[PDB]
Write a structure and sequence with these properties.
Six copies of one chain form a homohexamer. The first copy, chain A, has 75 residues and is mostly beta strands. The first copy, chain A, has no helices and eight strands. The radius of gyration of chain A is 28 Å and the shape is elongated. The first copy, chain A, starts with a strand and ends with a strand. Chains A, B, C, D, E, F: This is Microtubule-associated protein tau. Chains A, B, C, D, E, F: It is found in: Cytoplasm, Cytosol; Cell membrane; Cytoplasm, Cytoskeleton; Cell projection, Axon.
Chain lengths: 75, 75, 75, 75, 75, 75
């Protein structure tokens, strides 16, 4: 005479809040930007960004991972 | 006479909130941007961005992954 | 005469709050920016950023991971 | 052999006479008002009132509150 | 053999007379008001009131509160 | 053999007279008011009031509070 009852329960929340969240930027103001260049020389890849006000968010991460396993065996 | 009951339960939430969320940009203002260039020389790939106000979000990540396994065996 | 009852329960919160969260940037102001360049020379990759006010967030991390295992055995 | 008699009595006035009451503004006079404006400039919310005579009442308060409880309990 | 008689009595008046009461403003007079403005500049919320005679009452308070409790208990 | 008689009595007045009461402003007179402004500059919240005669009352307080409790107990 044998009886087995297996009833594991899971409610575990897995959460990631990555980047810029809930922030308040009330009335920000970028000032005047002047850029001047003369007779410059470049012999490889040039990368440039110019701007009075910039707001950047970048998230290569934040990815959640969950692994689980339920096993039972008899004789 | 043998009895087995297997009834695992799962309600586990997996959540990712990646990037820019719930932010408030109340009345932001970009200032004047002036760019001037004369007699420049470039001998490879040029990449350029110019703008009074910029807002950028980039999320290569944030991807959730879940693995699960339910196994039973008898004799 | 044998009876087994297996009923583990889980409500565990796993949480990451990575980056900029809940901040208040009330009326910030970037000053005037003037950049001048003459007769410069470059022989490798040039990278440049210019701006009166910048706000950057970058999150390669913050990714949660959960591993779990439930095992039972009889004879 | 037990007797209880329970007969609390209440006549308590709870009263508020808030704001402006019983006042006598006998023959008041507002004088001449002149407002002159030239070349003004406004860049967020403007609120304005102009008048020779103003007579104002404002009552966020005055709110009466009562809580009471009669209880009895036996064995 | 027990007898109990419970007959508390209350006539307590709770009264608030908050603000302007019974005042007599016999023949008051506001004089001439002249306002002049030239080339003014405003960059945030502006609030303005102008007037020869003002009579203002404001009552956020005065709210009465009463809590009471009658209890009896036996064995 | 036991007898109890409970008969507390209350006639307590709780009174607040907050603000301006019974005043007589017999024939008051505001003088001439001249306001002049030129080339002013504002970068913050501006609040302004101008007037020949002002009569102001403000009452955040004056709120009465009463707590009472009648309790009896046996064995």
């Amino acid at each position: 005479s044998v009886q087995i009852v297996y009833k594991p329960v899971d409610l575990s929340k897995v959460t990631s809040k990555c980047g810029s969240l809930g922030n308040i930027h009330h009335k920000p103001g970028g000032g005047q930007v002047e850029v001047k260049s003369e007779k410059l020389d470049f012999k490889d890849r040039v990368q440039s960004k110019i701007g009075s006000l910039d707001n950047i968010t970048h998230v290569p991460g934040g990815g959640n991972k969950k692994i689980e396993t339920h096993k039972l065996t008899f004789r």
